[PDB]
């Protein structure tokens, strides 16, 4: 009685009533509760993970013989979680000089993967030649049988993604089922960078191919970073690919979709500065994103806004 | 429980003995083709059909009444009539009852309707 409701835990007149347990009854536990045992909920933080690598892991397998011998050159390249600032030209010059002296395919190639990565971090455009100078002949040229070390593929791909480049499309296509089949082995990061660059250069068809591939290879969709998916879906103006992107938009999760809408709305919004190259206006795509979001999320009932204009008829 | 297109094609090329596909199309006028290994029990008759003993049934529909353990797949244009017939196959208790959604339309590329019901509701 009042405008302040009795809090039923503290109030004896609640507690000790006939609809609850009086103090003269024997005070035991009524029923057991297994909640966490019956159905268990997996852990998804609302905050992203703190210690994750966040980049592309290039998988350095080198024999501990050359890994001692090549140390003065390697030290200038990236090791684990360490990114030396040495000028890219110097490193490429080092590889160009010494690499023919060493006889192993594996060692040279791992070395090269590291060179590509180091150059991908500084965005130097003159790296791609190393692909055409050494590797192109035995891997992508004229149906050569040789199958490249995965590290190399990942590294070059990351380079094409970091430094915006067309060449990526030839590599990507070689990695499907019929080709080398390195597609299932990609990090979530890889797919993120891929989609981001591809969306920047504005290929609708590249985007459709890659999303098809991600859906099939069972990559982690909702954990693909929002920025890249929004940029990638931003570049799409073509009618068919647009249909594909509605039908594909259903492949995400409820939360992911809400923060796709949010990311998108921030990116042409206040956070337009967050990007190195500003976005390009796509109105239909942005709209359909916010629409998908409005559909998949739960509906709230606002009777005054719905029925605002309603009138009864005696018909 | 749904049966997808792949399942249907795979069941055209490599059929199971005791898996019966079943045609629910109501009007003989609109059925111009044949589903592989299918059998015709029209939706409108289902309620009576399932009440029959195996002999009476064989007599009326010219094929054996599937056992209740056997897989029964239902088929129609839209999938609607195949679903109502599905409930009918479920009520008489049949253990495996499957419904192809948009079945004969997806199969033969025909655009037809088992019933005319339209998306739009008439304003109250």
């Amino acid at each position: 009685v009042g405008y302040t409701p009795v809090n039923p835990d503290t109030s004896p007149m609640v507690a000790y009533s006939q609809y609850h347990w009086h103090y003269n009854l024997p005070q035991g536990m009524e029923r057991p509760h297994s909640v966490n045992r019956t159905f268990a909920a997996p852990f998804q933080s609302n905050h992203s993970l703190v210690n994750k690598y966040r980049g592309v892991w290039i998988e350095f397998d080198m024999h501990p013989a050359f890994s001692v011998a090549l140390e003065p050159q390697l030290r200038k390249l990236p090791r684990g979680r360490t990114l030396p600032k040495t000028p890219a030209e110097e490193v490429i010059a080092d590889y160009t000089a010494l690499a023919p002296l060493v006889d192993d395919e594996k060692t040279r190639d791992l070395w090269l993967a590291k060179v590509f990565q180091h150059c991908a971090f500084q965005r130097c455009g003159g790296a791609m030649e190393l692909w055409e100078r050494y590797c192109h002949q035995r891997f992508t040229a004229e149906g050569a049988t040789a199958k490249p070390p995965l590290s190399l593929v990942k590294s070059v791909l990351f380079y094409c993604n970091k430094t915006d480049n067309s060449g990526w499309r030839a590599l990507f296509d070689r990695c499907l089922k019929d080709g080398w089949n390195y597609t299932p082995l990609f990090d979530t990061a890889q797919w993120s960078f891929m989609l981001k660059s591809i969306g920047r250069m504005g290929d609708e068809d590249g985007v459709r191919a890659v999303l098809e591939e991600m859906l099939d290879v069972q990559a982690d969709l909702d954990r693909v970073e929002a920025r890249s998916v929004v940029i990638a879906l931003n570049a799409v103006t073509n009618a068919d690919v647009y249909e594909f992107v509605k039908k594909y938009l259903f492949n995400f999760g409820e939360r992911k979709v809400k923060f796709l809408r949010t990311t998108y709305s921030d990116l042409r919004g206040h956070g337009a500065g967050k990007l190195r190259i500003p976005l390009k206006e796509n109105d239909n795509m942005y709209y359909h994103v916010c629409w998908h979001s409005s559909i998949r999320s739960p509906r709230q009932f606002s009777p005054r806004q719905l029925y605002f204009d309603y009138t009864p008829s005696t018909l | 429980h749904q049966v997808y297109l792949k399942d249907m094609l795979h069941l055209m090329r490599y059929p199971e003995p005791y898996t019966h596909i079943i045609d629910c199309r109501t009007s003989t006028q609109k059925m111009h083709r044949w589903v592989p290994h299918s059998l015709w029990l029209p939706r409108d008759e289902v309620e009576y059909a399932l009440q029959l003993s195996a002999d009476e049934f064989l007599d009326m529909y010219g094929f054996r009444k599937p056992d209740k353990s056997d897989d029964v797949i239902l088929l129609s244009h839209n999938g609607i009539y195949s679903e109502q017939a599905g409930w009918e196959w479920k009520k008489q208790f049949f253990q495996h009852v499957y419904n192809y959604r948009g079945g004969t339309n997806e199969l033969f590329g025909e655009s037809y309707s088992d019933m005319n019901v339209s998306d739009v509701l008439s304003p109250w």
Binding site: - | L5, L9, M12, G109, D119
Partner: peptide, 21 residues
Amino acid sequence: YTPIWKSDPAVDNVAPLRDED
């Protein structure tokens, strides 16, 4: 709000198989 996207083309899925066979 329906339909969401363009329904599939008229394609006949049965014919190609039976033709191969």
